Structure 1
Amino acid sequence: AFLDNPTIILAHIRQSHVTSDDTGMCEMVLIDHDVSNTAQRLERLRKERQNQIKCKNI
C-alpha cells in the first residue's frame, strides 16, 4: 500500500478514529472546523487527626 504523504495519513487517522470509536468523544473532539479524591483524603485525614492526637509520647 501507499500511505506515506501526511495528507492521506491525516485523513485516515481522523476517519478511523471518528467512525470506529464507540464512545462519543472522538466525533466531538475531532471536529474538522479547526482542522475529587484528594479532597476526600484531606477530609479523612482532617477528621482522623483531631481524634489522633490526645496523648504525649516521650
Structure 2
Amino acid sequence: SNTAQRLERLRKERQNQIKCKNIQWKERNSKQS
C-alpha cells in the first residue's frame, strides 16, 4: 500500500546510515581530579 512502501523504503537507508561513528561532546571532565 502507501505506507507499506514507505516502511520498506525507510529501511533501505537505515542499512547505509549505520556505517558512521558519531561521538558527541558530553559536558564532563576530571574536574575533581
TM range (shorter): 0.5 to 0.7
Q: Which has the higher contact order (CA 8 A, sep 6+)?
A: 1
CA RMSD of aligned residues (A): 0.8
Q: Which runs of 4+ in 1 moved over 4 A?
A: none
**Structure 1 length-normalised TM:** 0.36
- Quick one: which amino acid aligns to residue 14 of structure 2? R
> Aligned pair 1:37/2:2, yes or no?
yes
Unaligned runs of 5+ in 2: 24-33
- Identity of aligned pairs, percent? 100
**Structure 2 length-normalised TM:** 0.55
Larger Rg: 1
Matched pairs, number: 23
Structure with more of its chain in helix, by fraction: 1
Structure with more of its chain in strand, by fraction: 2
